[PDB]
C-alpha cells in the first residue's frame, strides 16, 4: 500500500485518414495514469451501447507503479459516417 | 561463474516440431540435475520433467509423460527440450533449472533467462502504419500525435520518433491479441498545441521478422 | 507533315481515397490519342457547368505525331459527397 | 583549334550576385568581339551586349543597359558576365559568341556550349503520391491503375513501375502549371481487367531536388 490513487487519462483519437481510405475503420481510445489495475471500456454510439468488435487489456507501462489500457473498436467506414463521433467510457471508479 | 544461457525466442505454428536448448556453464555439468518448468501466461508454474547429465534417468510429470521428451548433450554441456505435434495450448514460458550445492536433488535453486515460445495458426504479415492525426478541431489542452501499427503477427515491434529523438513525451502501449491473431499497438507523444510539427513529427516503425522499414509523418 | 485525325480519350478517374478522405479533392481526366491539338475541357456537376479551379493544357506525348491533354478539378471533399460522380466532357469535335 | 569553354551550371536564389565565365582559346583574344545571348526556355534569342578584348568598348542592348554588366580579362583571355540583384525572370540559357574571319563585326559565327541559370524563387514542396484506384465499380473494358503526383515545385519528375518494369502500357503525361505555382502530372498503365495486381502494381516516384523516395502500391 501507500501508493496514492490517480485518475485515468482519457485520450480518444478520431479515425485516421490512412485507415479510412479503403473499407476499414478502427477507433482507438488510450487510458493510462491509473494505479488500480481494473478497468472495462464500454463504447456507445449516440447514447446506444455498442460492443461489436472490442478488446481491452490492462498491461503495465513501466516501473512508475501505474498501469495502462488500450481499446480498439473496428467497424465499417459507412458506419462511422452514419452517426456522430463516438465516446469512450472508462468506468474506472465513476463516470468519466 | 555459474550461469545458464538459453536460445532465442521461437515462434512456430501448430503441427510443427520444436527443439529449444539451454546451455549451462561455470560448473561441472555431470552431477547437477537439469529440469524444465512451464509457465503459462497468467498461470502458475508447471513442472514437466528432469534429466541427469551423466546417464539418461528421466522422470517426467504424470501429465507430461508422452506429451514431451527431454534430452541433453554431456559432450557440449547443453540441455534440450524437443516437442512433437504442438498444439494451440503449448504457448508458454519455459525455463531451465538446476540443483544447488545445498538442499534436495529437485530443489532447483538456480534458474535461467527464459525462452518465449508462442504458437498460432496465423502467419506473418507486414504491419500497416496509420498516422493518427491529432485533434485539429479541438486544440484545447495539449496536442497528441502518433501512428497506428496494426495487422502484424510477431509481437516484438519497436517504434521510435525521428530516428530515436524526442525521448520525453513518447509512451508506447503494449499491443492486444485480437480475435484474428494479429496484434495492434499505439504510440503517442504529448506535445504543446502551439508546436504542431516542430521539425517533422515523423513516425519510425521497424519490423525485424518481415524487414519492413516504414517512415511516415503526420 | 502531319497525321490524319483520330479520336480522343475520355479516361476519367474518381477521386483517390487517400486524397478524398483528407481535406482535399481532385478530379483527374485523361485525354490523349488525338491529333488536333485543340481541346477545351468543361466540367459539369449533375448537368450544372462548374469551372472553379480547372486547368488544362495540350502537350505532345511522343514522336507518334499525336498530342495529349490533362485536366484537374480541385475542390473540397464535402463537395464530392454532396452530388453524384462528376463527368468529363472533351468537346473535341462533338459531344463525347 | 578554336573552341569556347564555359563554366558549369549555377543554381542560386534572387538577391545574390552571379558572375559566369567563358574562356576562348586557339585564337588571338584581342581583336574578336565577345558577346552574350540570352535564350529563355521556350522563347527565342535575346542579345544583351558585346565587349572588345583590347579596350573597354561596351555596347549594351537598350533593354539591358543597366540590368547586366559584361567584362573580360585580356591577361588570361577569359570573358565574364556579372549579375547584380537577380530576379525571378532571369532564369534562361546564356551563350558566348565571337566573330569569325569573314562577315560583319557582330556576325557571331562561333558559339560555345551553354550555361543554364535558374533561380525560380518559390517554395519547394515535397511530392505527395496518391494512388489512383481503378474503376472497381465498373470493370467494363480494360483496367487502368496509376498514382497522382501533386504538390511539387520542380518540374522534372521521373515515375517508373516496379523499379523500371512494365514498359508497355505506361504513358506519362506532362504536368500542368497551377495557380499556386505547383505542378501535377499523372501516369497510368493499360492492363487487362482480369489481371488486377499481377505482381504488385506498385508506383515508383523519384524526386531529385528534394530527395524523397516514395513507393506505394494500389
Coordinates of C-alpha atoms in Angstrom, one line a residue:
Chain A
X1 CA 0.0 0.0 0.0
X2 CA 1.0 3.7 0.2
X3 CA 0.6 4.5 -3.5
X4 CA -2.0 7.2 -3.9
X5 CA -4.8 6.7 -6.5
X6 CA -4.7 8.6 -9.7
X7 CA -7.5 9.5 -12.1
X8 CA -7.1 7.7 -15.5
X9 CA -6.4 9.9 -18.5
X10 CA -8.9 10.0 -21.4
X11 CA -7.4 10.4 -24.9
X12 CA -9.8 9.4 -27.7
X13 CA -8.4 9.9 -31.2
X14 CA -10.8 10.2 -34.2
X15 CA -10.4 7.6 -37.0
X16 CA -7.3 8.4 -39.0
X17 CA -7.3 9.0 -42.8
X18 CA -4.9 6.3 -43.9
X19 CA -7.1 3.7 -42.1
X20 CA -10.2 5.2 -43.6
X21 CA -9.0 5.2 -47.2
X22 CA -10.4 1.7 -48.0
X23 CA -13.2 -0.2 -46.4
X24 CA -11.7 -0.1 -42.9
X25 CA -12.1 1.8 -39.6
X26 CA -10.8 1.5 -36.1
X27 CA -11.5 3.6 -33.0
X28 CA -8.5 3.9 -30.6
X29 CA -9.0 5.0 -27.0
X30 CA -6.0 5.4 -24.8
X31 CA -6.3 5.0 -21.0
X32 CA -3.3 5.4 -18.7
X33 CA -2.1 7.0 -15.5
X34 CA -4.2 4.9 -13.1
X35 CA -3.0 2.8 -10.1
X36 CA -5.9 0.3 -9.7
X37 CA -5.4 -2.3 -12.4
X38 CA -9.1 -2.8 -13.0
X39 CA -10.9 -1.0 -15.9
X40 CA -13.5 -2.0 -18.5
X41 CA -14.0 0.1 -21.6
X42 CA -17.6 0.5 -22.9
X43 CA -18.4 2.0 -26.3
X44 CA -21.5 4.0 -27.1
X45 CA -22.9 5.3 -30.4
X46 CA -25.1 8.3 -29.6
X47 CA -26.3 7.0 -26.2
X48 CA -26.6 3.5 -27.6
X49 CA -24.3 0.7 -26.2
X50 CA -22.3 -1.0 -28.9
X51 CA -20.0 -3.9 -28.1
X52 CA -19.3 -5.3 -31.6
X53 CA -15.6 -6.0 -32.1
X54 CA -14.0 -4.6 -28.9
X55 CA -11.0 -5.8 -26.9
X56 CA -9.3 -4.3 -23.9
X57 CA -6.4 -5.4 -21.7
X58 CA -4.6 -3.9 -18.7
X59 CA -0.8 -4.1 -19.1
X60 CA 2.0 -2.5 -17.1
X61 CA 3.6 0.6 -18.5
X62 CA 6.9 0.8 -16.6
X63 CA 8.4 1.0 -13.1
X64 CA 6.1 4.0 -12.4
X65 CA 3.9 1.6 -10.4
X66 CA 0.8 2.5 -12.5
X67 CA -0.9 0.5 -15.3
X68 CA -2.2 1.4 -18.7
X69 CA -5.1 0.3 -21.0
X70 CA -6.0 0.3 -24.7
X71 CA -9.2 -0.5 -26.6
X72 CA -9.9 -0.9 -30.3
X73 CA -13.3 -0.6 -32.0
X74 CA -13.2 -2.0 -35.5
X75 CA -16.1 -1.2 -37.8
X76 CA -17.0 -0.2 -41.3
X77 CA -16.3 3.3 -42.7
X78 CA -20.0 3.7 -43.6
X79 CA -20.9 3.1 -40.0
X80 CA -18.7 5.9 -38.9
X81 CA -20.3 8.5 -41.2
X82 CA -23.8 7.3 -40.2
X83 CA -23.6 8.7 -36.7
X84 CA -21.8 11.4 -34.7
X85 CA -18.4 11.0 -33.0
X86 CA -18.2 8.0 -30.7
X87 CA -17.4 8.3 -27.0
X88 CA -15.0 6.3 -24.8
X89 CA -16.2 5.5 -21.3
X90 CA -13.6 4.4 -18.7
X91 CA -15.8 3.3 -15.7
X92 CA -12.7 3.1 -13.5
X93 CA -14.3 4.4 -10.4
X94 CA -17.0 6.8 -11.7
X95 CA -18.5 8.3 -14.8
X96 CA -15.6 9.7 -17.0
Chain B
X1 CA 30.7 -18.1 -12.5
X2 CA 27.7 -20.4 -12.8
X3 CA 25.1 -19.1 -15.3
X4 CA 22.5 -20.5 -17.7
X5 CA 22.1 -19.1 -21.2
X6 CA 19.1 -20.1 -23.4
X7 CA 18.2 -19.9 -27.0
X8 CA 16.3 -17.1 -28.6
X9 CA 12.5 -16.8 -28.9
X10 CA 10.9 -19.4 -31.2
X11 CA 7.6 -18.8 -32.9
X12 CA 6.0 -21.6 -34.9
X13 CA 2.6 -23.0 -36.0
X14 CA 0.6 -25.9 -34.6
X15 CA 1.7 -29.2 -36.1
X16 CA 5.4 -28.4 -36.3
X17 CA 8.3 -29.8 -34.3
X18 CA 10.4 -27.6 -32.0
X19 CA 13.6 -28.2 -30.0
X20 CA 14.9 -25.4 -27.8
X21 CA 18.2 -25.6 -25.9
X22 CA 19.7 -24.2 -22.7
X23 CA 23.4 -24.3 -22.1
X24 CA 24.9 -24.1 -18.6
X25 CA 28.5 -23.1 -17.8
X26 CA 30.6 -22.3 -14.8
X27 CA 30.2 -25.7 -13.1
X28 CA 30.7 -29.4 -13.6
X29 CA 27.8 -30.5 -15.9
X30 CA 27.8 -34.1 -14.8
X31 CA 26.2 -34.3 -11.4
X32 CA 23.6 -31.5 -11.3
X33 CA 20.0 -32.4 -12.3
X34 CA 18.6 -30.3 -15.1
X35 CA 14.8 -29.7 -15.4
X36 CA 12.2 -27.6 -17.2
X37 CA 9.3 -25.6 -15.8
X38 CA 6.4 -24.4 -17.9
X39 CA 4.7 -21.1 -17.0
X40 CA 1.5 -20.2 -18.9
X41 CA 0.7 -16.5 -19.3
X42 CA -1.3 -15.6 -16.2
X43 CA -1.0 -19.1 -14.6
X44 CA 1.5 -20.6 -12.2
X45 CA 4.5 -22.9 -12.7
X46 CA 4.1 -26.3 -14.3
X47 CA 6.8 -29.0 -14.0
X48 CA 7.3 -31.3 -16.9
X49 CA 10.4 -33.5 -16.2
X50 CA 14.1 -33.6 -15.2
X51 CA 17.2 -35.2 -16.7
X52 CA 20.6 -36.2 -15.5
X53 CA 23.8 -35.3 -17.4
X54 CA 25.7 -38.4 -16.5
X55 CA 23.2 -41.1 -17.7
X56 CA 19.7 -40.9 -19.1
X57 CA 17.5 -41.1 -16.0
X58 CA 14.3 -39.1 -17.0
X59 CA 11.4 -38.7 -14.5
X60 CA 8.6 -37.0 -16.3
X61 CA 5.4 -35.5 -14.8
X62 CA 2.3 -37.7 -14.8
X63 CA 0.7 -35.1 -17.1
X64 CA 3.7 -34.9 -19.4
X65 CA 4.8 -38.5 -19.8
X66 CA 4.5 -38.9 -23.5
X67 CA 3.5 -35.3 -24.3
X68 CA 7.1 -34.0 -24.3
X69 CA 10.6 -35.5 -24.4
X70 CA 13.7 -34.1 -22.7
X71 CA 17.3 -34.7 -23.7
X72 CA 20.8 -33.4 -23.1
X73 CA 24.3 -33.4 -24.5
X74 CA 27.0 -34.0 -22.0
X75 CA 29.8 -33.5 -24.5
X76 CA 28.9 -29.9 -25.0
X77 CA 27.1 -29.4 -21.6
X78 CA 23.8 -28.3 -23.1
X79 CA 20.2 -29.5 -22.3
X80 CA 17.5 -29.7 -24.9
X81 CA 13.7 -29.8 -24.9
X82 CA 12.2 -31.4 -28.1
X83 CA 8.5 -31.2 -28.9
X84 CA 6.3 -33.1 -31.3
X85 CA 2.8 -32.2 -32.7
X86 CA 2.5 -28.9 -31.0
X87 CA -1.0 -27.6 -30.1
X88 CA -2.6 -24.2 -29.5
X89 CA -2.3 -24.5 -25.7
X90 CA 1.5 -25.2 -25.8
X91 CA 2.4 -21.5 -25.9
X92 CA 4.0 -20.7 -22.6
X93 CA 7.3 -19.5 -20.9
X94 CA 9.8 -22.3 -20.4
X95 CA 12.8 -22.2 -18.0
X96 CA 15.8 -24.4 -17.3
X97 CA 16.7 -25.0 -13.6
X98 CA 19.5 -26.9 -11.8
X99 CA 20.1 -28.1 -8.3
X100 CA 22.3 -26.1 -5.9
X101 CA 25.1 -27.0 -3.5
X102 CA 22.5 -27.4 -0.7
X103 CA 19.1 -28.9 -0.4
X104 CA 17.3 -31.8 -2.1
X105 CA 18.1 -33.1 -5.6
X106 CA 14.9 -31.4 -7.0
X107 CA 15.3 -28.1 -5.2
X108 CA 16.2 -26.2 -8.4
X109 CA 17.8 -23.3 -6.6
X110 CA 19.2 -21.8 -9.9
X111 CA 17.2 -20.7 -13.0
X112 CA 17.8 -19.4 -16.5
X113 CA 16.9 -16.4 -18.5
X114 CA 13.7 -17.7 -20.1
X115 CA 12.7 -18.6 -23.7
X116 CA 9.5 -17.2 -25.1
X117 CA 7.6 -19.9 -27.0
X118 CA 4.4 -18.9 -28.9
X119 CA 2.3 -20.8 -31.4
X120 CA -0.6 -19.7 -33.5
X121 CA -2.4 -20.7 -36.7
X122 CA -1.9 -17.2 -38.2
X123 CA 1.1 -16.5 -40.5
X124 CA 3.5 -13.5 -40.6
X125 CA 2.2 -10.3 -42.3
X126 CA 3.7 -6.9 -42.7
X127 CA 2.3 -4.1 -40.5
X128 CA 0.4 -1.1 -42.0
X129 CA 1.3 2.2 -40.3
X130 CA -1.6 4.6 -40.0
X131 CA -0.7 8.2 -38.9
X132 CA -3.1 9.1 -36.1
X133 CA -4.0 12.8 -36.8
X134 CA -4.3 15.0 -33.7
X135 CA -7.4 16.8 -32.5
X136 CA -7.2 19.6 -35.1
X137 CA -10.9 20.5 -34.5
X138 CA -10.3 21.0 -30.7
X139 CA -6.9 22.3 -29.7
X140 CA -7.9 22.7 -26.0
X141 CA -5.1 21.2 -23.9
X142 CA -2.0 19.5 -25.3
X143 CA -1.6 18.1 -28.8
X144 CA -1.0 14.4 -29.2
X145 CA 0.4 12.9 -32.4
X146 CA 1.1 9.3 -33.2
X147 CA 0.8 6.4 -35.6
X148 CA -1.3 3.3 -35.6
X149 CA 0.5 0.0 -36.1
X150 CA -1.8 -2.9 -37.0
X151 CA -2.0 -6.2 -38.9
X152 CA 1.2 -7.8 -37.7
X153 CA 1.7 -11.3 -36.3
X154 CA 5.0 -11.0 -34.5
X155 CA 4.6 -9.3 -31.1
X156 CA 8.0 -7.6 -30.7
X157 CA 7.7 -4.3 -32.6
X158 CA 9.9 -1.3 -32.0
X159 CA 8.6 2.2 -32.6
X160 CA 10.8 5.4 -32.4
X161 CA 10.5 9.0 -33.3
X162 CA 12.9 11.0 -35.5
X163 CA 15.4 8.1 -35.6
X164 CA 15.4 7.9 -31.8
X165 CA 14.8 11.6 -30.9
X166 CA 12.1 13.1 -28.8
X167 CA 12.6 10.8 -25.8
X168 CA 10.3 12.8 -23.4
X169 CA 6.6 12.5 -24.0
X170 CA 6.6 9.3 -26.0
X171 CA 4.7 6.5 -24.2
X172 CA 4.5 3.1 -26.0
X173 CA 1.4 1.0 -25.1
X174 CA 1.6 -2.8 -25.3
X175 CA -0.5 -4.5 -28.0
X176 CA -3.6 -6.6 -27.6
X177 CA -4.3 -10.0 -29.0
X178 CA -7.3 -9.7 -31.4
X179 CA -9.6 -12.5 -32.4
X180 CA -7.8 -12.8 -35.8
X181 CA -4.5 -13.4 -34.0
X182 CA -3.0 -10.1 -35.1
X183 CA -1.8 -7.6 -32.6
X184 CA -2.1 -3.8 -32.6
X185 CA -0.4 -1.1 -30.5
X186 CA -0.4 2.7 -30.4
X187 CA 2.4 5.2 -29.5
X188 CA 1.7 8.9 -29.0
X189 CA 3.6 11.8 -27.7
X190 CA 2.4 14.7 -25.5
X191 CA 3.4 18.0 -27.3
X192 CA 2.2 21.6 -26.9
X193 CA -0.6 22.7 -29.1
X194 CA 1.4 25.7 -30.5
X195 CA 4.2 23.3 -31.7
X196 CA 2.3 21.3 -34.4
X197 CA 5.1 19.7 -36.4
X198 CA 8.2 21.2 -34.8
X199 CA 10.8 19.6 -37.1
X200 CA 8.9 16.8 -38.9
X201 CA 6.9 14.8 -36.3
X202 CA 7.6 11.7 -38.3
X203 CA 6.9 8.1 -37.1
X204 CA 9.5 5.3 -37.3
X205 CA 8.2 1.8 -37.1
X206 CA 10.6 -1.2 -37.6
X207 CA 9.7 -4.9 -38.0
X208 CA 12.5 -7.4 -38.0
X209 CA 10.6 -10.7 -38.8
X210 CA 9.3 -9.0 -42.0
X211 CA 12.0 -6.5 -42.8
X212 CA 9.6 -3.5 -43.4
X213 CA 11.0 0.0 -43.0
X214 CA 8.0 2.3 -42.8
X215 CA 8.7 6.0 -42.1
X216 CA 5.8 8.4 -42.3
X217 CA 5.0 11.9 -40.9
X218 CA 1.7 13.3 -39.6
Chain C
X1 CA 3.8 16.7 -92.5
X2 CA 1.1 15.9 -90.0
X3 CA -1.1 12.8 -89.3
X4 CA -4.8 12.1 -90.2
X5 CA -7.3 12.7 -87.5
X6 CA -8.1 10.3 -84.6
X7 CA -10.4 10.1 -81.6
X8 CA -9.5 11.5 -78.2
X9 CA -9.9 9.6 -74.9
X10 CA -12.4 10.0 -72.2
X11 CA -10.5 8.4 -69.4
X12 CA -11.8 9.7 -66.0
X13 CA -10.7 8.5 -62.6
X14 CA -12.7 9.0 -59.4
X15 CA -11.1 10.9 -56.6
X16 CA -8.5 8.7 -55.0
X17 CA -9.3 7.5 -51.5
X18 CA -6.0 8.8 -50.0
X19 CA -6.9 12.3 -51.2
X20 CA -10.6 12.0 -50.8
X21 CA -10.6 11.1 -47.1
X22 CA -8.2 14.0 -46.4
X23 CA -9.1 17.7 -46.6
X24 CA -8.7 17.8 -50.4
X25 CA -10.2 16.5 -53.6
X26 CA -9.0 16.4 -57.2
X27 CA -10.7 15.1 -60.3
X28 CA -8.3 13.7 -62.9
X29 CA -9.5 13.3 -66.5
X30 CA -7.1 11.9 -69.1
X31 CA -7.4 12.8 -72.8
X32 CA -4.9 11.5 -75.3
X33 CA -4.6 9.7 -78.7
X34 CA -5.9 12.7 -80.6
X35 CA -4.0 14.5 -83.4
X36 CA -5.7 18.0 -83.4
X37 CA -4.0 20.0 -80.6
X38 CA -7.2 21.9 -79.8
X39 CA -9.5 20.8 -77.0
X40 CA -11.2 22.6 -74.1
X41 CA -12.3 20.5 -71.1
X42 CA -15.6 21.6 -69.4
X43 CA -16.7 20.1 -66.1
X44 CA -20.3 19.6 -65.0
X45 CA -21.9 18.7 -61.7
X46 CA -25.2 16.9 -62.4
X47 CA -25.9 18.9 -65.6
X48 CA -24.6 22.1 -64.0
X49 CA -21.5 23.7 -65.5
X50 CA -18.8 24.2 -62.9
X51 CA -15.5 26.0 -63.8
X52 CA -14.0 26.6 -60.3
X53 CA -10.3 25.6 -60.2
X54 CA -9.7 24.0 -63.5
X55 CA -6.6 24.0 -65.7
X56 CA -6.0 22.2 -69.0
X57 CA -3.0 22.1 -71.4
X58 CA -2.3 20.3 -74.7
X59 CA 1.3 18.9 -74.7
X60 CA 2.9 16.4 -77.0
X61 CA 3.2 12.8 -75.8
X62 CA 6.0 11.4 -78.0
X63 CA 7.1 11.1 -81.7
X64 CA 3.8 9.4 -82.5
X65 CA 2.7 12.8 -84.0
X66 CA -0.3 12.9 -81.7
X67 CA -0.9 15.2 -78.7
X68 CA -2.3 14.6 -75.2
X69 CA -4.2 16.6 -72.6
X70 CA -4.8 16.6 -68.8
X71 CA -7.3 18.4 -66.6
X72 CA -7.6 18.8 -62.8
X73 CA -10.6 19.9 -60.9
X74 CA -9.7 20.9 -57.3
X75 CA -12.4 21.2 -54.7
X76 CA -13.4 20.3 -51.2
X77 CA -14.1 16.7 -50.2
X78 CA -17.5 17.6 -48.8
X79 CA -18.5 18.9 -52.3
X80 CA -17.7 15.5 -53.8
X81 CA -20.1 13.7 -51.4
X82 CA -22.8 16.4 -51.9
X83 CA -23.5 15.3 -55.5
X84 CA -23.1 12.3 -57.8
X85 CA -20.0 11.4 -59.8
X86 CA -18.7 14.2 -62.0
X87 CA -18.4 13.9 -65.8
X88 CA -15.6 14.9 -68.1
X89 CA -16.5 16.5 -71.4
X90 CA -14.0 16.7 -74.3
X91 CA -15.7 18.9 -76.9
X92 CA -13.0 17.9 -79.4
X93 CA -15.3 17.7 -82.4
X94 CA -18.6 16.6 -80.9
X95 CA -20.4 15.5 -77.8
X96 CA -18.4 12.7 -76.2
Chain D
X1 CA 41.9 24.6 -82.7
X2 CA 39.5 27.3 -81.7
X3 CA 36.9 26.4 -79.1
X4 CA 34.9 28.2 -76.4
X5 CA 34.6 26.6 -72.9
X6 CA 32.1 27.9 -70.3
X7 CA 31.5 27.5 -66.6
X8 CA 29.3 24.8 -65.1
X9 CA 25.7 25.1 -64.2
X10 CA 25.0 27.6 -61.4
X11 CA 21.8 27.4 -59.2
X12 CA 21.2 30.4 -57.0
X13 CA 18.4 32.5 -55.5
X14 CA 17.3 36.0 -56.3
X15 CA 19.1 38.8 -54.4
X16 CA 22.5 37.3 -54.9
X17 CA 25.2 38.2 -57.4
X18 CA 26.4 35.9 -60.1
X19 CA 29.5 36.0 -62.4
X20 CA 29.8 33.3 -65.0
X21 CA 32.8 33.0 -67.3
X22 CA 33.5 31.7 -70.8
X23 CA 37.2 31.3 -71.9
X24 CA 38.2 31.2 -75.6
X25 CA 41.4 29.5 -76.8
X26 CA 43.1 28.7 -80.2
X27 CA 42.9 32.3 -81.4
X28 CA 44.2 35.8 -80.7
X29 CA 41.9 37.1 -77.9
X30 CA 42.4 40.8 -78.7
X31 CA 40.5 41.6 -81.9
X32 CA 37.4 39.3 -81.9
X33 CA 34.2 40.9 -80.4
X34 CA 32.8 38.8 -77.5
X35 CA 29.1 39.0 -76.6
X36 CA 26.4 37.2 -74.8
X37 CA 23.0 35.9 -76.0
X38 CA 20.1 35.1 -73.6
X39 CA 17.6 32.3 -74.5
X40 CA 14.6 31.8 -72.3
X41 CA 13.1 28.3 -72.1
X42 CA 10.6 28.2 -74.9
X43 CA 11.5 31.6 -76.2
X44 CA 13.9 33.0 -78.8
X45 CA 17.3 34.5 -78.6
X46 CA 17.9 37.8 -76.7
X47 CA 21.0 39.9 -77.2
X48 CA 22.3 41.8 -74.1
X49 CA 25.7 43.3 -75.1
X50 CA 29.2 42.9 -76.5
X51 CA 32.7 43.8 -75.4
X52 CA 36.1 44.3 -77.0
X53 CA 39.1 42.4 -75.6
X54 CA 41.6 45.1 -76.5
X55 CA 40.0 48.1 -74.8
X56 CA 36.7 48.6 -72.9
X57 CA 34.2 49.4 -75.7
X58 CA 30.9 48.1 -74.4
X59 CA 27.7 48.4 -76.4
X60 CA 24.7 47.0 -74.4
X61 CA 21.2 46.3 -75.5
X62 CA 18.7 49.2 -74.9
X63 CA 16.7 46.8 -72.7
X64 CA 19.9 45.6 -70.9
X65 CA 21.7 48.8 -70.3
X66 CA 22.0 48.8 -66.5
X67 CA 20.5 45.4 -65.9
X68 CA 23.7 43.5 -66.6
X69 CA 27.4 44.3 -67.0
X70 CA 29.9 42.5 -69.1
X71 CA 33.7 42.3 -68.6
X72 CA 36.7 40.3 -69.7
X73 CA 40.3 39.6 -68.7
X74 CA 42.8 40.0 -71.5
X75 CA 45.7 38.7 -69.4
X76 CA 44.1 35.2 -69.2
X77 CA 41.9 35.6 -72.3
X78 CA 38.6 34.9 -70.5
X79 CA 35.3 36.8 -70.7
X80 CA 33.0 37.3 -67.8
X81 CA 29.3 38.1 -67.3
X82 CA 28.5 39.6 -63.9
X83 CA 25.0 40.0 -62.5
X84 CA 23.6 42.1 -59.6
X85 CA 20.2 41.7 -57.8
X86 CA 18.9 38.8 -59.7
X87 CA 15.1 38.4 -60.2
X88 CA 12.8 35.5 -60.8
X89 CA 12.7 36.3 -64.6
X90 CA 16.4 35.9 -65.1
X91 CA 16.2 32.1 -65.5
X92 CA 17.4 31.5 -69.0
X93 CA 20.2 30.0 -71.2
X94 CA 23.2 32.1 -71.9
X95 CA 25.8 31.6 -74.6
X96 CA 29.1 33.4 -75.6
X97 CA 29.7 34.1 -79.2
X98 CA 32.6 35.6 -81.2
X99 CA 33.1 37.0 -84.7
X100 CA 34.7 34.9 -87.5
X101 CA 37.3 35.7 -90.1
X102 CA 34.6 36.7 -92.5
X103 CA 31.4 38.7 -92.2
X104 CA 30.4 41.7 -90.1
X105 CA 31.8 42.6 -86.7
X106 CA 28.6 41.4 -85.0
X107 CA 28.1 38.3 -87.1
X108 CA 28.8 35.9 -84.2
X109 CA 29.6 32.9 -86.3
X110 CA 31.0 30.8 -83.5
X111 CA 29.3 29.8 -80.3
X112 CA 30.0 27.9 -77.0
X113 CA 28.2 25.2 -75.1
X114 CA 25.7 27.0 -72.8
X115 CA 25.3 28.0 -69.2
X116 CA 21.9 27.3 -67.7
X117 CA 20.9 29.7 -64.9
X118 CA 17.7 29.1 -62.9
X119 CA 16.6 30.9 -59.7
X120 CA 12.8 30.4 -59.7
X121 CA 12.3 31.8 -56.1
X122 CA 9.4 29.7 -54.7
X123 CA 8.6 27.1 -52.1
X124 CA 9.9 23.6 -52.9
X125 CA 7.1 21.3 -51.8
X126 CA 7.5 17.6 -51.4
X127 CA 5.5 15.5 -53.8
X128 CA 2.6 13.6 -52.3
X129 CA 1.8 10.4 -54.2
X130 CA -1.9 9.5 -54.3
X131 CA -2.7 6.0 -55.9
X132 CA -5.4 6.5 -58.4
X133 CA -7.6 3.4 -57.8
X134 CA -9.1 1.8 -60.9
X135 CA -12.8 1.6 -61.8
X136 CA -13.6 -1.2 -59.3
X137 CA -17.3 -0.5 -59.6
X138 CA -17.3 -0.8 -63.4
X139 CA -14.8 -3.3 -64.9
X140 CA -16.1 -2.9 -68.4
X141 CA -13.2 -2.6 -70.8
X142 CA -9.6 -2.5 -69.6
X143 CA -8.3 -1.8 -66.1
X144 CA -6.2 1.3 -65.6
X145 CA -4.1 1.8 -62.4
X146 CA -1.8 4.8 -61.6
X147 CA -0.8 7.3 -59.0
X148 CA -1.3 11.0 -58.6
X149 CA 1.9 13.2 -58.2
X150 CA 0.9 16.6 -56.8
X151 CA 2.3 19.4 -54.7
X152 CA 5.8 19.6 -56.1
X153 CA 7.7 22.7 -57.3
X154 CA 10.4 21.2 -59.5
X155 CA 9.1 20.2 -63.0
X156 CA 11.5 17.3 -63.8
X157 CA 10.0 14.2 -62.0
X158 CA 10.6 10.6 -63.0
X159 CA 8.0 8.0 -62.5
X160 CA 8.6 4.2 -63.0
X161 CA 6.7 1.0 -62.3
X162 CA 8.3 -2.0 -60.4
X163 CA 11.8 -0.4 -60.4
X164 CA 11.5 0.2 -64.2
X165 CA 9.5 -2.9 -65.3
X166 CA 6.2 -2.9 -67.2
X167 CA 7.4 -0.9 -70.2
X168 CA 4.3 -1.5 -72.3
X169 CA 1.1 0.3 -71.3
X170 CA 2.7 3.1 -69.2
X171 CA 2.1 6.6 -70.6
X172 CA 3.5 9.6 -68.7
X173 CA 1.6 12.9 -69.2
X174 CA 3.4 16.2 -68.8
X175 CA 2.5 18.3 -65.8
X176 CA 0.4 21.5 -65.8
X177 CA 1.3 24.8 -64.1
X178 CA -1.4 25.5 -61.5
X179 CA -2.2 28.9 -60.0
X180 CA -0.2 28.2 -56.8
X181 CA 3.0 27.5 -58.9
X182 CA 3.0 23.8 -58.1
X183 CA 2.8 21.3 -61.0
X184 CA 0.9 18.0 -61.1
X185 CA 1.1 15.0 -63.5
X186 CA -0.5 11.6 -63.8
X187 CA 0.8 8.3 -65.1
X188 CA -1.4 5.2 -65.7
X189 CA -1.0 1.8 -67.4
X190 CA -3.4 -0.1 -69.5
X191 CA -3.8 -3.6 -68.0
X192 CA -6.4 -6.3 -68.5
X193 CA -9.3 -6.3 -66.1
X194 CA -8.7 -9.9 -65.1
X195 CA -5.1 -9.1 -64.1
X196 CA -5.7 -6.7 -61.1
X197 CA -2.4 -6.6 -59.3
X198 CA -0.3 -9.1 -61.3
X199 CA 2.9 -8.9 -59.2
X200 CA 2.4 -5.8 -57.1
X201 CA 1.2 -2.9 -59.4
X202 CA 3.3 -0.5 -57.2
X203 CA 4.2 3.0 -58.2
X204 CA 7.7 4.4 -58.1
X205 CA 8.1 8.2 -57.9
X206 CA 11.5 9.8 -57.5
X207 CA 12.3 13.5 -56.8
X208 CA 15.9 14.6 -57.0
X209 CA 15.7 18.2 -55.8
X210 CA 14.0 17.1 -52.6
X211 CA 15.4 13.5 -52.2
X212 CA 12.1 11.9 -51.5
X213 CA 11.8 8.2 -52.2
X214 CA 8.0 7.4 -52.1
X215 CA 6.9 3.9 -53.1
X216 CA 3.2 3.0 -52.7
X217 CA 1.1 0.2 -54.3
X218 CA -2.5 0.2 -55.4

